């Protein structure tokens, strides 16, 4: 951990000249306020004011005044600063009256964690799986369509393909303070998944944001381009953000039950049932972009139906074989483009709602591949995820459970942002249309 | 040998930062899970989970969970890592319940060795002879069609042609812990061979995998391309992986018999008979690719008929003149594209099946060249190896002996992989067809 005196001590010792007061907007973009080291005491006293309306994105209507409350445990010094050291602090947004801002995603996740603690669950242990594509750049340094390499699943190439720009990333992350579990080449060519050890939900989301920033910076250093776009290319695998979750009550895994046939407690089953019930509502948050629903197509391991299994091609919820203190529920819908705080908040809230109402877990899907007709699917009660952003937004609006998780202020602005994005997308005339038509008609 | 404490000691001393947990899939490709040195103890405790379905290749249908059990004796530190040292460990695949995975090729070879030990044969001593081609690269770093040199059998061109990027490979392998016997230029231009000393079957297969990886890396360093393709060019010799085998029972060669006219025991003759009878069934494993059967054509020293001799053009089985503790049975069908574990497993299982049933050795073929007609060949009872991958797959399916060696799980996935490969190959229209036709018709 750290204290004010500790932060000042390292800042003086490390010759830190500039401090980034980092926060996140509703779209997951990393925003910051740059600060000279002479203002560190003022920042640590929670006295820095900024717009605060920058959270709303491009739909902000009026300028507000809001305070940054830095989290001392998030202090870190970037390694690539070299000459003039730059540090960062992750801050919470507070209204001038003293109450936290209802539109801050970190505050939303904290509030959902608090109402979870109200049920006796001390912590939510989360381990994500953020995969990214490494593309080549041109003379101006713009992302091309060529991948850095043409490797496969767990492929080994010590030259500069399987690993390539990954060893340096892992080294940098570990130096900063990231507990890296393992790294490997993903199914699609030019995909390298780096995994971290499990942490608490807020720490996990902070680590996701920092990981994305670090990966982008290091890839740019090597003359490459790193993207967390859910589906950058047609016909190849997309990028997911499978989230492994387990609720804890005083370092006891409440999901574990040795007496159960699957080693799953009734609490875990209620959690999974709650997540399954509200999946179509959370789809707009865990899959927020238009491109997110080009990944949710059959044949590329991405989930397309709301179902759970212990072994299947692509279930919505997968339960890993690990048991004991590491029994987990893996949700595979989210893509790395999702806001980590909002995604974790809505998933936790859906699980807690399932726990509250004691929902009944539907039967798991067997090796029965979904080649079955739609009549078979709705006869067996297997729902499907939304086909595009519009359906997800409609389900989000109609939902009363996870809209409460978002809150009244954030829901309206998120809906406005996504509605504008969809409206801009739907009126475009794409090159595919000009290829099919313009000669036939 | 090595122990946990030893591995930790060298890892700390050598400044090893990254560890490769290497394993092999059904196609012989080397796969790995990269690991930071901070996870070395966790890896050595056999607690690392990975997909495990990556063994099946591109026909995997569902994600599993498997544990990596590293083999401490396989530890080595790569010499080219320089700045950040990278080490490797070869691991076995285990199911979460604790039993070994049935689809792991290394486990398959271990199981066949165990059932060999059940008959009193403590070890199987194997010496392979892998050959490879060196090609010049272009500016983009892709292999061209031009060989690195134009030497012949046992030629000597000290400057840049004879040894060139072969002396360095031998030196690096020697530093890596290999026991190299000799190296020489092969018959075809640009073709080289490096021989190792004999070792146990599992060690031999591990050395084959490491040798292929090291040769490829060092050739890439010298601006060349190394390939183990069975027949990269038409009209020149192909590359084989002749396997010299001898069964041992308490450091006594059971193949040796001083009283015999040829110095061959009845056990050795039964072994050869068993290998001969099951040759067509093993062809799909020892010659797994489509290109493998372009090598099995007459006139290039590759075997084309199921027969044995002490001196002939190209017999399936050759018996070297060495006697005593070095009496060996050389099988010349395999090409370097074969999976070493699977090939050794099927050859050993066929030999053991011959031993069990006291199979009768057919008469050796004399200097009678196979210019004889097909009627003469089937009158003398000389079978022929399959002409393409399809025949080999059909024989593999119909076989009940070496299919048991593969096991139920690996057989189905190998058959699916090879069926897909053959189906993609057979529907292609090649440039040869467009040269013969498209003008005449």
């Amino acid at each position: 951990s750290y204290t004010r005196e500790d932060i000042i001590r390292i800042a003086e010792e490390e010759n830190v000249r500039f401090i980034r007061l980092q926060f996140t907007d509703l779209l997951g973009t990393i925003k910051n306020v740059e600060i000279p080291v002479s203002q560190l005491e003022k920042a640590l006293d929670n006295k820095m004011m900024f717009d605060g309306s920058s959270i709303e994105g491009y739909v902000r209507i009026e300028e507000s005044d809001m305070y940054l409350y830095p989290d001392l445990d998030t202090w870190v010094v970037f390694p690539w600063v070299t000459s003039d050291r730059v540090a960062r602090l992750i801050c919470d947004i507070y209204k001038p009256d003293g109450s936290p801002f209802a539109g801050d995603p970190r505050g939303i996740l904290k509030r959902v964690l608090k109402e979870a603690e109200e049920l006796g669950y001390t912590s939510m242990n989360v381990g994500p799986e953020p995969e990214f594509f490494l593309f080549k750049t041109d003379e101006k340094g713009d992302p091309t369509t060529e991948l850095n390499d043409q490797g496969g699943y767990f492929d080994l190439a010590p030259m500069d393909l399987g690993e390539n720009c990954r060893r340096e990333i892992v080294l940098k992350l570990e130096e900063m303070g990231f507990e890296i579990e393992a790294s490997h080449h993903e199914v699609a060519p030019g995909q390298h998944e780096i995994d971290f050890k499990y942490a608490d939900a807020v720490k996990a989301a902070d680590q996701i944001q920092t990981f994305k920033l670090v990966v982008k910076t290091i890839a740019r250093q090597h003359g490459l381009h790193a993207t967390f776009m859910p589906k950058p290319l047609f016909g190849v695998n997309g990028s997911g953000m499978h989230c492994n979750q387990s609720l804890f009550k005083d370092n006891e895994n409440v999901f574990y039950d040795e007496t159960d046939e699957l080693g799953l407690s009734q609490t875990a089953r209620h959690y999974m049932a709650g997540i399954l019930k509200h999946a179509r509502a959370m789809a707009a948050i865990t899959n927020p972009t238009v491109n997110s629903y080009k990944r949710l197509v059959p044949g590329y391991e991405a989930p397309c139906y709301v179902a759970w299994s212990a072994s299947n091609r692509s279930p919505m919820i997968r339960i890993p074989a690990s048991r004991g203190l590491s029994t987990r529920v893996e949700v595979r819908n989210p893509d790395p483009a999702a806001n980590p705080y909002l995604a974790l908040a809505v998933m936790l809230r859906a699980g807690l709602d399932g726990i509250k109402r004691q929902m009944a877990l539907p039967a798991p899907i067997d090796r029965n591949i979904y080649v079955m007709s739609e009549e078979e699917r709705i006869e067996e009660g297997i729902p499907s995820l939304p086909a595009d952003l519009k359906e997800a937004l409609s389900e989000l609006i109609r939902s009363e459970v996870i809209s409460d998780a978002l809150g009244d202020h954030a829901l309206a602005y998120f809906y406005e942002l996504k509605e504008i994005e969809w409206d801009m997308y739907r009126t475009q005339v794409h090159q595919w249309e000009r290829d099919q038509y313009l000669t036939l008609y | 040998s090595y122990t946990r404490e030893d591995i930790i000691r060298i890892a700390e001393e050598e400044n090893v930062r990254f560890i490769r947990l290497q394993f092999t899939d059904l196609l012989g490709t080397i796969k790995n899970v990269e690991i930071p040195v901070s996870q070395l103890e966790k890896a050595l405790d056999n607690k690392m989970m990975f997909d495990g379905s990556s063994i099946e290749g591109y026909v995997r249908i569902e994600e599993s969970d498997m544990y990596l059990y590293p083999d401490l004796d396989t530890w080595v530190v790569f010499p080219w890592v320089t700045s950040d040292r990278v080490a490797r460990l070869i691991c076995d695949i285990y199911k979460p319940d604790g039993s070994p995975f049935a689809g792991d090729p290394r486990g398959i070879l271990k199981r066949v060795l165990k059932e060999a030990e059940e008959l009193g044969y403590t070890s199987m001593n194997v010496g392979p002879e892998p050959e490879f081609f060196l090609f010049k690269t272009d500016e983009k770093g892709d292999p061209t069609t031009e060989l690195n040199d134009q030497g012949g059998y046992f030629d000597l061109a000290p400057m840049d042609l004879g040894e060139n990027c072969r002396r360095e490979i031998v030196l690096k392998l020697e530093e890596m812990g290999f026991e190299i016997e000799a190296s020489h230029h092969e018959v075809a231009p640009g073709q080289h061979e490096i021989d190792f000393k004999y070792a146990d079957a599992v060690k031999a297969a591990d050395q084959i995998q490491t040798f292929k990886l090291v040769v490829k890396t060092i050739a890439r360093q010298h601006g060349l391309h190394a390939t183990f393709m069975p027949k990269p060019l038409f009209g020149v010799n192909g590359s084989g992986m002749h396997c010299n085998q001898s069964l041992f029972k308490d450091n006594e060669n059971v193949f040796y018999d001083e009283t015999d006219e040829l110095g061959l025991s009845q056990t050795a003759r039964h072994y050869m008979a068993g290998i001969l009878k099951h040759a067509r069934a093993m062809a799909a494993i020892t010659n797994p690719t489509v290109n493998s059967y372009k090598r099995l054509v007459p006139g290039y020293e590759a075997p084309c008929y199921v027969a044995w001799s002490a001196s002939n053009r190209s017999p399936m089985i050759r018996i070297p003149a060495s006697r005593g503790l070095s009496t060996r049975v050389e099988v010349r069908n395999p090409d370097p594209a074969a999976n070493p574990y699977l090939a050794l497993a099927v050859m050993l299982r066929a030999g053991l099946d011959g031993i069990k049933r006291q199979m009768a050795l057919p008469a050796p073929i004399d200097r009678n060249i196979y210019v004889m007609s097909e009627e003469e060949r089937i009158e003398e009872g000389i079978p022929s190896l399959p002409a393409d991958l399809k025949e080999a797959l059909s024989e593999l399916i119909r076989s009940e002996v070496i299919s048991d060696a593969l096991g139920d799980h690996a057989l189905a996935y190998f058959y699916e992989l090879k069926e897909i490969e053959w189906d993609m190959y057979r529907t292609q229209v090649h440039q040869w067809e467009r040269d013969q036709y498209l003008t005449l018709y």
């Binding site: 199914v187 060519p189 695998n237 059959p298 044949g299 590329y300 591949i369 | 591109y58 026909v59 993609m424």
Partner: peptide, 10 residues
């Protein structure tokens, strides 16, 4: 089910 995996032939 397996289509994106078969990209090595394509």
């Amino acid at each position: 089910l397996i289509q994106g995996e078969l990209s090595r032939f394509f």
